[PDB]
Amino acid sequence: PVTLYDVAEYAGVSYQTVSRVVNQASHVSAKTREKVEAAMAELNYIPNRVAQQLAGKQSLLIGVATSSLALHAPSQIVAAIKSRADQLGASVVVSMVERSGVEACKAAVHNLLAQRVSGLIINYPLDDQDAIAVEAACTNVPALFLTASDQTPLNSIIFSHEDGTRLGVEHLVALGHQQIALLAGPLSSVDARLRLAGWHKYLTRNQIQPIAEREGDWSAMSGFQQTMQMLNEGIVPTAMLVANDQMALGAMRAITESGLRVGADISVVGYDDTEDSSCYIPPLTTIKQDFRLLGQTSVDRLLQLSQGQAVKGNQLLPVSLVKRKTTLAPNTQTASPRALADSLMQLARQVSRLE
Template sequence: MTDRKTITLADVAALADVSQQTVSRVVTGNGQVAAHTRARVNAAIAHLNYVPNRLAIGLARQRTYSVGFATTDLSLHAPSQLTAGIEQAAREAGYSLLVSIVAANGLSATTHTLRGLRERQVDGVLLNVSLDTADVLEVQRRFPGLPCVFMDVPIGTPVPAALLDQAHGARLAAEHLLELGHTRVAILDGPRHAVVESARHHAWRDALATHDLTPVAHLEGDWSPASGYAATLRLLAGGVPFTAILVANDQMAVGVLRALWERGLNVPADVSVVGYDDTPESALLIPPLTTVRQDFPTLGARAFAHLLNLLGTEDPHSLQVLTVPELVIRASTAPPSVERQSVQAALETLRAALAAHGG
């Protein structure tokens, strides 16, 4: 059996007709290299099937060239899409990604996960776990030497963060319904512990308040379609008149649409539904779902770039990176029908009269 020659940095440099230092800059991602030269080096690397010795590079630079991503349930849309965006950005920068699932909410589970990533000698961590300001600061206190970018904390928390402007997205959704003429709007929230959900909820209420309105009902789900279905059945059983519902994510909105269909209600003629996230399936639902688009792969890439800056020369307490969602209007929303508004107003008057007489 013939031994194969081990391809070296010098072989790549010779084929690309550049110096070994230039090849090193391309491989490590450190230093400026002209785009056409980088392309030539990468072509030589691919042709020779050169595999850089990351361990040697890491030892020389006191880095492992790996980062951790601590996140919640990957079966949910947001964590899975964030993982895709982060992994691609990390790979392009020459880093490997270690994904670790946080088993439960709260500081204790987060600490356990971060300790495990720290034991794997990651250079830094991206943390997609819902934490309030106090818990965020405690995480920094417990892991003072671990560069960390937070992805689910209140805007304004004095830590490095890459966030979506949840309040802005929620306002867009509520204002859309208000512009259509809806005045009886129900809210279906996600879990109460979620920081992002708190921001959306308050923005929904604030938008309604500008029109002297309050939600006619407030329910809570767990992000799953089943919880959206169950919450909508409870809402309908309660007899509270409503012409629209704001839903905290598209997966719960799937359950909402199912429950309304089973009860013979037409969307949007009887009830308008607005989701949040813009999952790939949202445009294929019946009817296609009006929703707030969050570009999670881009957010993941921006979060990784922010962490990469922290691993370089940037101040570890640098300002937050904020990404703005956008409203996608589809067929699940329309102005409320005059007939349905009249019927619901009559029902509301009857309910108030019964309540006043103890009925």
């Protein structure tokens, strides 16, 4: 071919030196790594082996099957994963799952397996039935799941959906709310269904039935649209539990644009605690999920599993309510007709001043 001995006799260096480069920067002065890496590139030279160029002094090589990095939560996690995996001197190989469902995910795994990975993290939302089908596909390779579900028997880490829903409900019940609406994610999504189940569960335990229930698509816009729809249908709760912070944003807008006050008239609770919620108007009470932690933890755990020790269990991570300004004790006090008529008059005056 173009050999390892050709790279060397024209570039002026030994075959210990060309072979020390092929691996990683160690005992060769950084100034002689320019005489080699330009002599390799200007004659096209490469590995075999190419997993013989991942041959030492040890590897853990880990595969991740994830939802789109477009989406905020999955990016947080993978960031953390990649990040932490680095600290531990293991490498990460992502395989994105442009949707949707289990055949999609089963495929993303069969890829990672073809790339001879030593462990798997599944960051893709699956109901328990399907998660089992996937675990089947992992075939003698340790597999940690960051989204299940149904309880599950397998290796998992998740945040407590039970806690999240409980905290929110309890918060509002304790502020003395009785008229409550839910705004869930799309129901194709397992995470949405779990969240909603949770809300029902705990509201039932406080002798409460939600006065309305709706379904967004995770986007703020859908939070606005559904909330608008609802208020226009004359349904006007004192509080809303919302399945993520972005829909909560859209709800808040719907409310505000409907002539109501967020908190003082309709309290709202989110989920996720995104960077931006702290500066919504007003700042948004929500459930914190530390995705960076989930990601980082999942790596420690996976390395352990790949040496036959760890929790071969399922594992939960705590969450927490973050009180801010969208939660206040209920209030149906609301402007009097005389006050509205006055506001109207003011705009009639402004109107008459136009062309």
